[PDB]
Design an enzyme around this catalytic site. Structure first.
Site, PDB file in Angstrom:
ATOM      1  CD  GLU A  25      -3.691   0.014   0.390  1.00 29.52           C
ATOM      2  OE1 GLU A  25      -3.405  -1.253   0.442  1.00 29.52           O
ATOM      3  OE2 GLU A  25      -4.215   1.227  -0.586  1.00 29.52           O
ATOM      4  CG  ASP A  33      -7.296   5.615  -6.194  1.00 31.08           C
ATOM      5  OD1 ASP A  33      -7.381   5.187  -4.965  1.00 31.08           O
ATOM      6  OD2 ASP A  33      -6.869   6.801  -6.238  1.00 31.08           O
TER       7      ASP A  33
END
Ligand SMILES: CC(C)CCC[C@@H](C)[C@H]1CC[C@H]2[C@@H]3CC=C4C[C@@H](O)CC[C@]4(C)[C@H]3CC[C@]12C
Ligand SMILES: CC(C)CCC[C@@H](C)[C@H]1CC[C@H]2[C@@H]3CC=C4C[C@@H](O)CC[C@]4(C)[C@H]3CC[C@]12C
Ligand SMILES: CCCCCCCC/C=C\CCCCCCCC(=O)OC[C@H](O)CO
Ligand SMILES: CCCCCCCC/C=C\CCCCCCCC(=O)OC[C@H](O)CO
Ligand SMILES: CCCCCCCC/C=C\CCCCCCCC(=O)OC[C@H](O)CO
Ligand SMILES: CC(C)(C)NC[C@H](O)COc1nsnc1N1CCOCC1
Length: 439
Positions: free
Chosen positions: A209, A218
């Site tokens: 992550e 993202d």
């Protein structure tokens, strides 16, 4: 021919001095590198620096000239320094291995239990004791052989061949090299096993992550911060900052600390866990899985949500039936594997084996441990053949020659110049080197 090798040996001497001074300066200048581990690395680099300045140059002179023109005093002092540096290096590495063992077994994972002032004392004693065990048996003539060929070399100033008695050759090799070697290899093998055992989902997610202290977009384009904590799906930047100020409880201005990033990361993981127990589909699957496969299931929920992971009707089915290999194929036959392959592959491989083979040396501190393992491993591969041949010559003194003995000693001498190149692995050292070289 003599020139062709003389140039090579000069490039060795320079590479050892250049590289080790560069390592020492970086740890002494930059505060970020002033850690307990790098204090031992400094000790290790100084041993190699003394090797490149006071051992290898005179060793090279002894070979090309085929005689010793530095007298009977420096012959012994040179041999003592040579024995010192090797002893000091292997014991420093053994201490590093032990230090890393007590660091990873404690809850303060990757943090040394030793303080900076205590670490300097360890180093100091490792050089004092190695000083006595290297110099004293050479300066007090306990090493010397009693046969005629040896006595002729000690009397002659132009001869500096290292003839030893059978007792010294065994006793010194065991105490100076084999004892700290066996312990190092045994203790640091455990370090790799503790790393592969103690890593949980808090590190698993942190790895795939990532962590960013500022607001970023993202893969999907939504505003995210910290360790994949989605702030909002809205295209507004102030909306993301508004949800960030709400979540933390202060005017962040799109910037947070590592503490606040971890606090949110704890909440997100717990919410994922609770969400699995809540959802009727994910509830029985989580119970049938072991501690490692549960972490892989929570990882998917952390990325897609409880509703999204519930869509894998065939994968969840076979994960409860202990049919790992088949369930892992169906996870590849989904839009999740196609979107983020590297992450999905690691999560699928976690369900496959039930081990952490996919997340081996992926975390920052684990790469740091692997680097230290390469330092130890290289030292072993470069010095072990010399010491093996050293004890073999004591048993049967007509099996190994002089040229073979000196050649293996130089594979050990060229090891002093390897460490700085191996330190490039560490991101902290790369930045430090290219800053000192002004690049
Ligand atoms: C003179 C030749 C033969 C060998 C002697 C070298 C000795 C003095 C050197 C080699 C490695 C050195 C240590 C390397 C690292 C550290 C940690 C540093 O933060 C403070 C000093 C300290 C503790 C050094 C003290 C001096 C030291 C022990
Ligand atoms: C005969 C020759 C090889 C002996 C000379 C040994 C040299 C290399 C030793 C002697 C004392 C040493 C220093 C003692 C103290 C420190 C401070 C520490 O923060 C980094 C290592 C450092 C900077 C050492 C570097 C190496 C050093 C300069
Ligand atoms: C890269 C391979 C090149 C081939 C090998 C030749 C190396 C040069 C030889 C000796 C230099 C020894 C001196 C050590 C280098 C000093 C540079 C340094 O570390 O920088 C100091 C810093 O700038 C202070 O603030
Ligand atoms: C020859 C006389 C010298 C006698 C002294 C040697 C005795 C130690 C022997 C073997 C273990 C090797 C490892 C010893 C170094 C310990 C490193 C260290 O301090 O360990 C960190 C730990 O966290 C601290 O609590
Ligand atoms: C065939 C198997 C290989 C056997 C190899 C035998 C080596 C003996 C090692 C240490 C004993 C001396 C004590 C040294 C000080 C303690 C070091 C320590 O902390 O080690 C923890 C251990 O590695 C966690 O299993
Ligand atoms: C043989 C010569 C010229 C001294 N080179 C020495 C080696 O490179 C360093 O040797 C050692 N370091 S720690 N213990 C040793 N030895 C190995 C040989 O037998 C005596 C002790």
């Amino acid at each position: 021919w003599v020139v062709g090798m003389g140039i090579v040996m000069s490039l060795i001497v320079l590479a050892i001095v250049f590289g080790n001074v560069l390592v020492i300066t970086a740890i002494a200048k930059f505060e970020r590198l002033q850690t307990v581990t790098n204090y031992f690395i400094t000790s290790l680099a100084c041993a190699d620096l003394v090797m490149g300045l006071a051992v290898v140059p005179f060793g090279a002179a002894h070979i090309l000239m085929k005689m010793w023109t530095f007298g009977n005093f420096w012959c012994e002092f040179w041999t003592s320094i040579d024995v010192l540096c090797v002893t000091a290096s292997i014991w420093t590495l053994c201490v590093i291995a032990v230090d890393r063992y007590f660091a990873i077994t404690s809850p303060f994972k990757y943090q040394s239990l030793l303080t900076k002032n205590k670490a300097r004392v360890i180093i100091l004693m490792v050089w004092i004791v190695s000083g006595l065990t290297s110099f004293l048996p050479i300066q007090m003539h306990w090493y010397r052989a009693t046969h005629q060929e040896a006595i002729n070399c000690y009397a002659e100033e132009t001869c500096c061949d290292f003839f030893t008695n059978q007792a010294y050759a065994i006793a010194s090799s065991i105490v100076s090299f084999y004892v700290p070697l066996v312990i190092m290899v045994f203790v640091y093998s455990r370090v790799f096993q503790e790393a592969k055992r103690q890593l949980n989902i808090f590190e698993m997610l942190r790895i795939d992550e990532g962590l960013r202290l500022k607001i970023y977009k993202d893969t999907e384009g939504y505003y995210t911060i910290g360790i994949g904590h989605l702030l909002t799906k809205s295209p507004s930047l102030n909306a993301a900052k508004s949800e960030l100020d709400k979540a933390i409880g202060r005017n962040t201005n799109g910037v947070i600390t590592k503490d606040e990033a971890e606090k949110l990361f704890n909440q997100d993981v717990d919410a994922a866990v609770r969400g699995i127990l809540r959802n009727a589909k994910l509830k029985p699957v989580y119970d049938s899985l072991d501690a490692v496969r549960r972490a892989a299931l929570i990882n998917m929920v952390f990325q897609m949500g409880e509703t999204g992971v519930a869509g894998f009707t065939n994968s969840l089915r076979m994960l409860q039936q202990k049919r790992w290999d088949e369930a892992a194929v169906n996870l590849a036959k989904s839009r999740w594997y196609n979107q983020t392959p590297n992450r999905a592959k690691r999560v699928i491989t976690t369900f496959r084996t039930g081990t952490w083979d996919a997340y081996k040396f992926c975390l920052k501190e684990h790469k740091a441990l692997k680097t230290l393992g390469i330092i130890m491993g290289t030292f072993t591969l470069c010095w072990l053949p010399f010491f093996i041949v050293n004890i073999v010559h004591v048993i049967q003194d007509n099996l190994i020659r002089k040229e073979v003995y000196i050649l293996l000693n130089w594979i050990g001498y060229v090891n002093s110049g390897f460490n700085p190149l191996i330190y490039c692995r560490s991101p902290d050292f790369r930045i430090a080197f290219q800053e000192l070289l002004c690049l």
